[PDB]
Amino acid sequence: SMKTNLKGETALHRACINNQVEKLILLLSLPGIDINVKDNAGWTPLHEACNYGNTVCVQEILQRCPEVDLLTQVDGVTPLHDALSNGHVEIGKLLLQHGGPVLLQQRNAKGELPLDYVVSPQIKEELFAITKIE
C-alpha cells in the first residue's frame, strides 16, 4: 500500500481534503492505484472530497476512475450521505448522475437516507431528476 499519516490517510485522501486537484489528477493516473483505499477508520478519498465540498475533486474521481465504489461506507455513511449532510448539493447531483438511484436507498447506522438531509422539496426533485436512469 501507499504511505500514510497517523490517521491512515494516503496522498489521495490528503489531495481530496485539501482540494489539490492537480495533485489528485496525477495520483489518479498511477498504475495499480486503489481509488477505494480506506484510512484507519474506513473513509475513502471520495468520502473526503464529498465531506469537505471539493466539487472538482469529486468530478475528477468520477471521470477518471471507472471502478470507484459509490456505496463504500463508515457507520453506514456513504459519499452521498456525506455530501448532502454538509449541504453540498452539487456534489450530490454529480454522484447521482454517475451512480443511479441505488445511492438514494442507503440507510446509515442511524437509519437516515441521504435525502433526509434535504429540506427543500424542490432540491429533492432536482436531485431525483438528475439521477442516472439505467
Binding site: 497517523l6 477508520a41 456525506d82
Partner: peptide, 12 residues
C-alpha cells in the same frame, strides 16, 4: 454545524 469524519490513529 459541519459534520466531520471520525478518525483512528495508528502507526504500523
Amino acid at each position: 454545524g459541519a459534520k466531520r469524519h471520525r478518525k483512528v490513529l495508528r502507526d504500523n
